[PDB]
Every structure is written in C-alpha cells, then in structure tokens.
Short mmCIF file of C-alpha atoms and ligand atoms in Angstrom, two decimals:
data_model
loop_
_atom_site.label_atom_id
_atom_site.label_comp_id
_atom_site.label_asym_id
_atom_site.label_seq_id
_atom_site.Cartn_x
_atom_site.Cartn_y
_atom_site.Cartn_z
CA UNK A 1 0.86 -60.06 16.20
CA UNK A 2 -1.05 -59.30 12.72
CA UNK A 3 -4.21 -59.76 14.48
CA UNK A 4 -4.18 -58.16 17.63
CA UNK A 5 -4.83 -54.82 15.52
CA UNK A 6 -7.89 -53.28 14.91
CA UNK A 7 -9.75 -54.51 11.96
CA UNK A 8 -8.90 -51.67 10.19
CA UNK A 9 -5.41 -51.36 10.80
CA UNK A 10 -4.21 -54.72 9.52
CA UNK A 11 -2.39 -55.78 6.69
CA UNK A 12 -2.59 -58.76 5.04
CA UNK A 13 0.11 -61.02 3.48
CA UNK A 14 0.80 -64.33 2.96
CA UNK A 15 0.91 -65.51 6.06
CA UNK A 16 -2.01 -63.84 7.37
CA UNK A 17 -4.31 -63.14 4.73
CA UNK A 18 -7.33 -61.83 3.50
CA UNK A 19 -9.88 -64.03 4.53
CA UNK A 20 -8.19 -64.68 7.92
CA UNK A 21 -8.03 -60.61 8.43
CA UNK A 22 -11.15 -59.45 6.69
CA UNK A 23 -13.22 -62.58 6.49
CA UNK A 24 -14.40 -64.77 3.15
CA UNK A 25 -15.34 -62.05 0.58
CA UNK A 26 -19.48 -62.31 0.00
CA UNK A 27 -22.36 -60.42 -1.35
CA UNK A 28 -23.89 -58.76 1.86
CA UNK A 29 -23.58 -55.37 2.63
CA UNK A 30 -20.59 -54.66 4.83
CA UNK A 31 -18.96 -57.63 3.83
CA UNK A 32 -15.91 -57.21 1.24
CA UNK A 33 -16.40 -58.38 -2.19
CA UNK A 34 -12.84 -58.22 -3.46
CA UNK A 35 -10.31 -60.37 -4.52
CA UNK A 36 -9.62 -63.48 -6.98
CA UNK A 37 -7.48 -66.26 -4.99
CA UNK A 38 -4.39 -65.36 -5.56
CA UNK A 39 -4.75 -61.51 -4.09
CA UNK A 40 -7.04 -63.62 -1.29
CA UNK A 41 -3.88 -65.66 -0.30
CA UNK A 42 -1.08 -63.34 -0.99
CA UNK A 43 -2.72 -60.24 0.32
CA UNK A 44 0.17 -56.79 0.20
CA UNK A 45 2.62 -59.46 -0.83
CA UNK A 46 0.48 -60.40 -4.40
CA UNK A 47 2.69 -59.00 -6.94
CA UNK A 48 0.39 -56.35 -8.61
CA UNK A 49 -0.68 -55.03 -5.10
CA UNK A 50 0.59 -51.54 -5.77
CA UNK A 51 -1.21 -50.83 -9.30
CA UNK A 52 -4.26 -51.76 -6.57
CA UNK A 53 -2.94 -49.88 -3.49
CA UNK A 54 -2.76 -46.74 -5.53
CA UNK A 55 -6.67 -45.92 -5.53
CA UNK A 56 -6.95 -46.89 -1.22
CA UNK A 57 -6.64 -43.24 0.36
CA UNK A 58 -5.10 -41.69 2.50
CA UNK A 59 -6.41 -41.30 6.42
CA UNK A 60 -7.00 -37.70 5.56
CA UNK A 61 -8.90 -38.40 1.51
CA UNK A 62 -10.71 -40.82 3.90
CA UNK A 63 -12.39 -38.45 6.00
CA UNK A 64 -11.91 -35.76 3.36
CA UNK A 65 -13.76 -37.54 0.47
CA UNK A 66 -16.20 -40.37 2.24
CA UNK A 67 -19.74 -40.04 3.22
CA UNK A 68 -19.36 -40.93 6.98
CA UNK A 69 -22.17 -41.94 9.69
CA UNK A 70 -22.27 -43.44 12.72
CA UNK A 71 -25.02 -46.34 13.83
CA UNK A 72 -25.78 -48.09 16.94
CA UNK A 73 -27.43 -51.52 16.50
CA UNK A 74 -27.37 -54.67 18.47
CA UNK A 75 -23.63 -55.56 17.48
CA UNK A 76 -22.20 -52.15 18.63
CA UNK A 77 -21.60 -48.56 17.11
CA UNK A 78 -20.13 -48.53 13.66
CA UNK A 79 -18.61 -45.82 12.14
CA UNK A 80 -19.97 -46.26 8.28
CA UNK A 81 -18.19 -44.75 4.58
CA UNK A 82 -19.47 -44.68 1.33
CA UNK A 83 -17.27 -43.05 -1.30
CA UNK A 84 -15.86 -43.30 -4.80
CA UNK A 85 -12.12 -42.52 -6.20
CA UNK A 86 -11.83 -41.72 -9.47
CA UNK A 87 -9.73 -42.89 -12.25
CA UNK A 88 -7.43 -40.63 -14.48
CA UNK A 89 -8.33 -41.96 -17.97
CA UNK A 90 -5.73 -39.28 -19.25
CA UNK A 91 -3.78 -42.28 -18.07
CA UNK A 92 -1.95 -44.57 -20.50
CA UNK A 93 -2.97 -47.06 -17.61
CA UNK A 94 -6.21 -46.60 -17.34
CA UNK A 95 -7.13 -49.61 -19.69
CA UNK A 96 -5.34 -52.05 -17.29
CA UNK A 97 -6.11 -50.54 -14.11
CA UNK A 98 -9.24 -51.40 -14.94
CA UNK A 99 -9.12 -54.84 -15.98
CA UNK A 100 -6.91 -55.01 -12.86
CA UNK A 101 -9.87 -54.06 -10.82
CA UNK A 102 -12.46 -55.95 -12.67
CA UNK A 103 -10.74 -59.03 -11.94
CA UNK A 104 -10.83 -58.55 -8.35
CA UNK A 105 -14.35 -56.93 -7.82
CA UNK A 106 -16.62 -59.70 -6.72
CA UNK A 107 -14.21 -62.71 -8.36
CA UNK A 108 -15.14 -64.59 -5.38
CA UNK A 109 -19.06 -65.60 -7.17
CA UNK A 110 -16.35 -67.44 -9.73
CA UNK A 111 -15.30 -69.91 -6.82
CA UNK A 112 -16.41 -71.70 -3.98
CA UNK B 1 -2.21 -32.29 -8.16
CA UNK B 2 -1.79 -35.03 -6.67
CA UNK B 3 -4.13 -37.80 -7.04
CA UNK B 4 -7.27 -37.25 -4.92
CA UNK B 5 -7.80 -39.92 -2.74
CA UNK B 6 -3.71 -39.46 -1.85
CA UNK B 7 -3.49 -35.82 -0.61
CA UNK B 8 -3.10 -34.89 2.78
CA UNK B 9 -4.98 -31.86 3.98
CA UNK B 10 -2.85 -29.58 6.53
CA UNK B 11 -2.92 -25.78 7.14
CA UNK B 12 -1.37 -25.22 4.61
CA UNK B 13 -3.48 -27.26 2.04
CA UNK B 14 -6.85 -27.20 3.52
CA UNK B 15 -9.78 -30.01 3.91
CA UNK B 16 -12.14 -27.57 1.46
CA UNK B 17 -9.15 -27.14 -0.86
CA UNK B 18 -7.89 -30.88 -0.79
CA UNK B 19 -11.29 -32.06 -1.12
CA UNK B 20 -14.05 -29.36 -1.76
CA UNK B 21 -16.79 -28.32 0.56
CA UNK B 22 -18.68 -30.28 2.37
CA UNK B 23 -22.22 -30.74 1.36
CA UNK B 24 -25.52 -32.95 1.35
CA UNK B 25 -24.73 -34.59 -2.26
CA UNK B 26 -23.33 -37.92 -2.88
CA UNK B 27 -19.95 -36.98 -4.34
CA UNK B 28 -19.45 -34.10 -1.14
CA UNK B 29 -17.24 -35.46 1.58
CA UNK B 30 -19.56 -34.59 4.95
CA UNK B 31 -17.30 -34.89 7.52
CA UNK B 32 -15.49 -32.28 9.24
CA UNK B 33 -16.05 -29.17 11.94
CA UNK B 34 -15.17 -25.63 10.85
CA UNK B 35 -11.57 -26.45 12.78
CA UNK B 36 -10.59 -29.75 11.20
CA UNK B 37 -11.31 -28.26 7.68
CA UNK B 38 -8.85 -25.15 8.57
CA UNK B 39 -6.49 -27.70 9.53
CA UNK B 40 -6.45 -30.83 8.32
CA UNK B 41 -3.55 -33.26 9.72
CA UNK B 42 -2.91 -30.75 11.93
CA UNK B 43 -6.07 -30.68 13.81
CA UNK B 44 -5.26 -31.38 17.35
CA UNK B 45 -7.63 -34.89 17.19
CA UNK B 46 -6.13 -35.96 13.95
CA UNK B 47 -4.72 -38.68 15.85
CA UNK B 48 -7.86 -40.13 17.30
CA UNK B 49 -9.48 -39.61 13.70
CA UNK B 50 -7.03 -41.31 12.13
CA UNK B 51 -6.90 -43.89 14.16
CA UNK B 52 -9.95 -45.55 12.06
CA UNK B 53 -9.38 -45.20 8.55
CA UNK B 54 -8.44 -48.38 6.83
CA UNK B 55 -5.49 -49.29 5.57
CA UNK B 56 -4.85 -49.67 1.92
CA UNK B 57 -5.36 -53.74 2.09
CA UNK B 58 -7.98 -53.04 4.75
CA UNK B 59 -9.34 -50.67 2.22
CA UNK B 60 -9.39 -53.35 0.09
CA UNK B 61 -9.81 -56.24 2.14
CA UNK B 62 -13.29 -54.58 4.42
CA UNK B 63 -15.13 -52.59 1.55
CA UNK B 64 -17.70 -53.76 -0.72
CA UNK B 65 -16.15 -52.52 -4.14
CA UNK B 66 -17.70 -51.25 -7.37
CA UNK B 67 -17.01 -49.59 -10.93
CA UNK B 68 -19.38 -46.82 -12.41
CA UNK B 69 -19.06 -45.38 -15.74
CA UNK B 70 -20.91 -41.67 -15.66
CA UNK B 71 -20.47 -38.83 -17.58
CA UNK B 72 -17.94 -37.34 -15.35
CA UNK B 73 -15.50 -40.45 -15.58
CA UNK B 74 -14.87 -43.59 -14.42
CA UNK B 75 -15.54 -44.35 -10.09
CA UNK B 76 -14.36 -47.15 -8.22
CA UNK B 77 -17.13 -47.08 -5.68
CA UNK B 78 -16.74 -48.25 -1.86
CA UNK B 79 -18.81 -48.76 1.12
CA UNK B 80 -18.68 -50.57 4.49
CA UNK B 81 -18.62 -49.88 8.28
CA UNK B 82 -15.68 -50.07 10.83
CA UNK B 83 -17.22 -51.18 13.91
CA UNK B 84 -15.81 -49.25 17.36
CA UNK B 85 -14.60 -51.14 20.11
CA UNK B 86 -17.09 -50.88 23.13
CA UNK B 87 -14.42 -51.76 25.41
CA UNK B 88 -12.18 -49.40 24.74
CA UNK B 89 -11.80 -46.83 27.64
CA UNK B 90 -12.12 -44.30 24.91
CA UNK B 91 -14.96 -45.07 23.24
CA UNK B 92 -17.32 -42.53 25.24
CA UNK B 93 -14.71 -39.79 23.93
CA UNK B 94 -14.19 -41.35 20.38
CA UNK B 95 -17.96 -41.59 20.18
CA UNK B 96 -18.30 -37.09 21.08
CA UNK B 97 -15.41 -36.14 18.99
CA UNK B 98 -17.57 -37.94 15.36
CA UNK B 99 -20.74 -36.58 16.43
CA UNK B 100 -18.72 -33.26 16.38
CA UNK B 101 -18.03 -33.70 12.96
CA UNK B 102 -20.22 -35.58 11.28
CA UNK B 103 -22.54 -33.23 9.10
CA UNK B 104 -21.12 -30.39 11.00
CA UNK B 105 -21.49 -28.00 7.79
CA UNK B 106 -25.07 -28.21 8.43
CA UNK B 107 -24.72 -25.01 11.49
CA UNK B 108 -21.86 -23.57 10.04
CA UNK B 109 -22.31 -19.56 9.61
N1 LIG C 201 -17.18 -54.55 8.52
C1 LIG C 201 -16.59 -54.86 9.73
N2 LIG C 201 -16.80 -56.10 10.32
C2 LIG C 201 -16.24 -56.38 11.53
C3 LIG C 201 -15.39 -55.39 12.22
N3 LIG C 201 -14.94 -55.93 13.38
C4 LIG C 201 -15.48 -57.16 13.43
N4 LIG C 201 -16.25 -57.42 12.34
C5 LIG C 201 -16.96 -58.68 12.05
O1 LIG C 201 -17.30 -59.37 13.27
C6 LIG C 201 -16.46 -60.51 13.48
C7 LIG C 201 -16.02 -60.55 14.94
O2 LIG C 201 -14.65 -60.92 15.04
P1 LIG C 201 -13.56 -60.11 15.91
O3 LIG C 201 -13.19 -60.92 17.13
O4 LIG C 201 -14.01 -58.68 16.08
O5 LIG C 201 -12.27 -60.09 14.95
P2 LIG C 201 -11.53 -61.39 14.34
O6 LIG C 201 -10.52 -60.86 13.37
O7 LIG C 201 -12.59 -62.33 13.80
O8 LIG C 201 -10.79 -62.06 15.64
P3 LIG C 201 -9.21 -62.08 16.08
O9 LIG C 201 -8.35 -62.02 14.84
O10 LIG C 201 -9.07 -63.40 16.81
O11 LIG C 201 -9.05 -60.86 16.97
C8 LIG C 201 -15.36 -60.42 12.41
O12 LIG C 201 -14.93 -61.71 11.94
C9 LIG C 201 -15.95 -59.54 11.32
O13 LIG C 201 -16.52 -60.23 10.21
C10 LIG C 201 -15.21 -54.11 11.53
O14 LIG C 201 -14.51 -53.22 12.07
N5 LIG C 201 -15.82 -53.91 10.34
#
C-alpha cells in the first residue's frame, strides 16, 4: 500500500522506510544524501521529524520557490528542482535546527 | 509572514507576492505562466501540478541536501529530479501543461 504511490508521494515510517522508499542515501547527483540511521529506519515516525519537516514546502513554495526543468534521457522524462529554504536565525532555534540538520546531511559517509 | 517555503499562493495571495517574480537568477523561482501566478492554488491545473511535488519525507528522503552560509543568511540547499511515469495515459498532457510553464516569464509582456 506505501509503495504503490508515486515516488514522490510516499511517506516513510517504520515499517516502510527510507531506504526501502527512496533508496540507500549516496553521493551521486539525484540520489538523497540525508539521514543518520535512526531517521533512515524510523522515517515520519523518528521522534524529531517535525523540527525537520518544518523546512520541506509546501506543493505551492515548491513550484513557487524551485528552479524547475524538465529532461528527457534514456531512463525517461524527469521533471528536475534545485532550490534553497532559508533559516530564521531571529530564531531562538536556529542553533539546533542546525545541528539537527547537520547530523542528517550526508551522515550516511559515517556508516556502511 | 508565514515561513516561506510554507505559504500557499491563491488569488488572494499571489505566486509573485508569495514568492517574488520569476526571473533568470538562482534564488528566482522560474516556474509559472502569467495565469498560475494570478492564481496560485486556484489555477484550474493546480491539481495536475501538484500532483508532483514531494512530500515532506519525500522532500527529505529524494533530495540531495546542503547548508550554505552567505551574507544573506543561512540556506538549506536541495536538488534532485522526480522522474514522470511514461505509462501513464497522461503523460502526453502532463508533459504540455510544464512546458507551459516552465520559464514562461521569458514572453511575458
Ligand atoms: N530521483 C528519482 N529516482 C527515481 C524516481 N523513480 C524511480 N527512481 C529510481 O529508479 C528506481 C526504479 O524503481 P521503481 O520501480 O520506479 O520504484 P521502486 O520504489 O524501486 O519499486 P516499487 O516500490 O516496487 O514500486 C528507483 O529505485 C529509484 O532509485 C524518481 O521519481 N526520482
């Protein structure tokens, strides 16, 4: 049932979860690069997902804020983004949000 | 004011208010006909628009993700692709409405 939807459109938790929606985080390209094991295994149900989920945007930031193109290629047509969100450092947060993110951006070199 | 990348542009509050004009540069959003920045979630294909942005843990989960510190402030970056699916009886359609809008701004009057 989780993955019958569109790449895009899933959600991963426990039971279904990062790597088995999104594939093993890497360094190439269009491959994701984020997450330490525990957001990896626990996906929306890791228990500092929303201090995360509050910089993904909205359908209409998404379209409204992102660099979009289109490509055709061997594999298909892909609809590509390129974008960047940022953070309020008026926030007493800011500090942890991001060590928060630093843990997660390309934690994955740290393990096999 | 509403954090940026969580507004919602409608009629009301449009795509060039929500999130400025479009433009060549690399912090302009370029997406967008003269129609879907008048009306935002209310543009008649907002549904098949929509229907490919990520979700917050596909966000997440899809994107290669970065940190920049500029003068301006601190950016998490993100990039990726979202691959269409050939087989969809839609695709021909899905494929005319983004060439409609992306880098429409360029013939705008
Ligand atoms: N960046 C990106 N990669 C994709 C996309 N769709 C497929 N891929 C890649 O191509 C592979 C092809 O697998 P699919 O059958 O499309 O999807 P899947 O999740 O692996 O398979 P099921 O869960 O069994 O449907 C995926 O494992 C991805 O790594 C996409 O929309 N974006």
């Amino acid at each position: 049932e989780a993955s019958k939807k569109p790449r895009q459109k899933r959600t991963a938790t426990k039971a279904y979860n990062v790597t088995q929606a999104f594939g093993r985080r890497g360094p190439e390209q269009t491959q994701g690069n984020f997450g330490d094991q525990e957001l990896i295994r626990q996906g929306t149900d890791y228990k500092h997902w929303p201090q995360i989920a509050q910089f993904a945007p909205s359908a209409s930031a998404f379209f409204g804020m992102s660099r979009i193109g289109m490509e055709v290629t061997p594999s298909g047509t892909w609809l590509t983004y390129t974008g960047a969100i940022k953070l309020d450092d008026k926030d007493p947060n800011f500090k942890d949000q991001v060590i928060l993110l630093n843990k997660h951006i390309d934690a994955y070199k740290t393990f096999p």
